[PDB]
Each structure stands twice: as structure tokens, then as C-alpha cells.
């Protein structure tokens, strides 16, 4: 959910447009994305796991497993795998609209509020 979000609908923020420059833009949409982090038995991981993929527990109804809990999941190949549940992360993603009417979906980490100190790499590419 949007619980704990530090950016409001209608807020003016700064972000990179695909043309390479940084511009002021307005927030027109907001959403949350919940992903699980799991460690596979082969030494690899996923930090993008759909909570609905876990088959040893109904995570949509009951919430996430305990941290460190051993789980079973169904991967995108349709097969079942064992993994260790590490943690759940809910992040906020925003849709912005530029002066020219173009739009872009941006993660919170790629947005700069107007109070934040901008890096030298951002002020040199900033359009007024
Ligand atoms: N903010």
C-alpha cells in the first residue's frame, strides 16, 4: 500500500527524461510493489519474487513467512523448488508527466525532491 510514502500525487519532482537531461515533472500516479527475497539451493537468489509464487504457505491471505523460514515455490518454468525465505520489501513507484506531456514510470530511488541536494552530475545536465 502507499503507507509510509514520502511523495504525494501532484508533487513537483526532478527526474531523468530518456533524452539524457534532468527536468522538473509532476507526479500523476502512485503504486506499491511487494517482492520477496529467496535463496535457492544452488547458491543463486531472487529479490523480485511474486508473493503468490510461494506454495508451502498462502502468503496472499496470511502474509509473509518468518525470516529464515524454509519454503517451497513454483518458478516461472512451472516447476517446484526449495528455497530459504530471507525478507519482504514493499517499494513505491510513481508515474510522472513532463512539460511536453510525455510520461514515465520511475522508482523512488531515481526521483529527486526539490529540497534534496543534487549531485554535480545532475546540476550539469539540468534543464530550466
Ligand atoms: N517529499
Swiss-Prot record:
<feature type="domain" description="Tudor 1">
    <location>
        <begin position="5"/>
        <end position="62"/>
    </location>
</feature>
<comment type="similarity">
    <text>Belongs to the JHDM3 histone demethylase family.</text>
</comment>
<protein>
    <recommendedName>
        <fullName>Lysine-specific demethylase 4B</fullName>
    </recommendedName>
</protein>
<feature type="domain" description="Tudor 2">
    <location>
        <begin position="63"/>
        <end position="119"/>
    </location>
</feature>
<comment type="function">
    <text>Histone demethylase that specifically demethylates 'Lys-9' of histone H3, thereby playing a role in histone code. Does not demethylate histone H3 'Lys-4', H3 'Lys-27', H3 'Lys-36' nor H4 'Lys-20'. Only able to demethylate trimethylated H3 'Lys-9', with a weaker activity than KDM4A, KDM4C and KDM4D. Demethylation of Lys residue generates formaldehyde and succinate. Plays a critical role in the development of the central nervous system (CNS).</text>
</comment>
